[PDB]
């Protein structure tokens, strides 16, 4: 029984490059995976013009690229989402798209894919008169794209509906599923996201469920670490939430990685322990791949003393640089841990911060003569929480001298943010803490920097209603 396992390269923003996949390709050798998929979303000729050919350069590099996937046996996927425009009563698109997956092919690809993932439900006036239902066409031309191609072993179609909270009413109800299930040839494998197009937890029942109407194991196109619906999130935790019983009742699992492409090595690692778990502890799957990553850090750089001056008694210290260590990369992972919960040393952070601000006034004005307990208690705490930031700091700090510095500047911007607004709340802390001998306004220099924290973006953030 075959299993796909792998990743899938589908998010917006700047590509990877030939370099990041061939890396990405080792490391997936490395770790026991055997899937890739190839649908970049800003990719003009994967999605927007689909109906155009390849280039002679973009030819070499797509065969340069496909042998090397040879060379690793990591199985090759070759998307394209024609949904964005194409006609289905029209021969001339069918034969358009005929032609492309054939250039694709003689390229030396195996596995294609169809996507119709966000696009619109409505249909041409064309399609009206001939197809009963959108599904039906979406069907028949998937259908016959598979008979032309030989039927190869894999391939992969993405309904419209993806998730649960896409389907109408339901997902038992669906027409469109139904449909799809109906009337979809039984060679073909069906990707699905879940309950949501960010699903927090996959309760087993739900696959089931969808199952009963597909017809058949779904592949999991998982966005646990995606991070392309806001930007600003960068995600470093292990994978999470996912029991293992799903895996006898799946065809394969297939992560959405971040943005960044240095950033989702523990992520694929995770993964990998995910499943060779069972052809599993959140807590040591993430403290394998941290050991692990850390030895892609190397050492700092240091001078190179190979007539050497050295440094007397009276003279001053040459500039050292510590080497990066577990305990910052276990902060760093808290700091950007996972979409719908923190780290616990962050969230713990976080909590005692909110507490000293709670309780500010047991000593922010005239502390003499008030209770010593409530004094000693909010003074320790808050000595508790600037050790804190000087570990943030200091995590910065080491992580900046690293030799291979490549790794930190992928993701340079996220650690460069919460060092400066770590920095800011302890100076914030510090004014709070000396107000009783201090009345002077907590201020950083001469002013309030943090009027300008995120500029617009900032300021309209700053105005939406929570709960909390």
Not at 36 to 62: G, I, N, T
Not at 335 to 352: C, D, S, T, V, W
Not at 447 to 459: I, N, S, V, Y
Request: include cysteine; charged fraction near 25%; charge should be negative.
């Amino acid at each position: 029984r075959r299993f796909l396992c792998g990743v899938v390269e589908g998010f917006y923003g700047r590509p990877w490059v030939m370099e990041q996949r061939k890396e990405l390709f080792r490391r997936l050798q490395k770790w026991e995976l055997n899937t890739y998929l190839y649908a970049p979303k800003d990719d003009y000729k994967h999605r927007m013009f689909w109906r155009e050919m390849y280039s002679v350069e973009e030819a070499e590099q797509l065969m340069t690229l496909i042998s090397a996937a040879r060379e690793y046996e990591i199985e090759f996927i070759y998307a394209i989402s024609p949904g964005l425009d194409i006609t289905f009563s029209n021969p001339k698109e069918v034969s358009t798209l005929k032609r492309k997956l054939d250039q694709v092919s003689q390229f030396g690809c195996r596995s294609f894919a169809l996507l119709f993932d966000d696009i619109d439900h409505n249909m041409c006036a064309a399609d009206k008169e001939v197809f009963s239902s959108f599904a039906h066409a979406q069907v028949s031309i998937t259908n016959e794209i598979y008979q032309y191609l030989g039927e190869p072993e894999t391939f992969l179609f993405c309904p419209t509906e993806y998730c649960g909270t896409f389907c109408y009413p339901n997902v038992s109800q669906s027409p469109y599923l139904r449909t799809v299930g109906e009337k979809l040839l039984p060679g073909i494998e069906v990707l699905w996201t879940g309950p949501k197009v960010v699903s927090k937890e996959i309760p087993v029942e739900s696959i089931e469920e969808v199952s009963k109407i597909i017809k058949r194991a779904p592949v999991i196109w998982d966005n646990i670490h995606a991070n392309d619906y806001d930007q600003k999130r960068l995600f470093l935790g292990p994978y999470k939430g996912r029991s293992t019983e799903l895996i006898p009742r799946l065809k394969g699992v297939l992560t959405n990685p971040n943005c960044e492409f240095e950033a989702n090595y523990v992520a694929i690692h995770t993964l990998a322990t995910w499943y060779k778990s069972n052809m599993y502890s959140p807590q040591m799957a993430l403290k394998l791949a941290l050991t692990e990553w850390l030895q892609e850090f190397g050492v700092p750089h240091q001078y190179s003393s190979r007539e050497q001056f050295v440094p007397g008694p009276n003279e001053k210290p040459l500039y050292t640089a510590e080497p990066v260590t577990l305990e910052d990369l276990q902060l760093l992972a808290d700091l950007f841990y996972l979409p719908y919960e923190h780290g616990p040393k962050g969230a713990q952070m976080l909590r005692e911060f909110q507490w000293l601000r709670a309780n500010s006034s047991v000593v922010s004005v005239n502390c003499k003569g008030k209770d010593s307990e409530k004094i000693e208690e909010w003074r320790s705490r808050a000595a508790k929480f600037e050790e804190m930031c000087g570990l943030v700091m200091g995590m910065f700090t080491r992580l900046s001298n690293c030799a291979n510095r490549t790794i930190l500047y992928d993701m340079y911007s996220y650690v460069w943010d919460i060092k400066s607004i770590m920095s800011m709340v302890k100076s914030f802390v510090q004014w709070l803490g000396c107000r009783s001998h201090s009345s002077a306004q907590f201020l950083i220099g001469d002013q309030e920097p943090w009027a300008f924290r995120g500029g617009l973006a900032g300021e309209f953030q700053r105005l939406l209603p929570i709960d909390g």
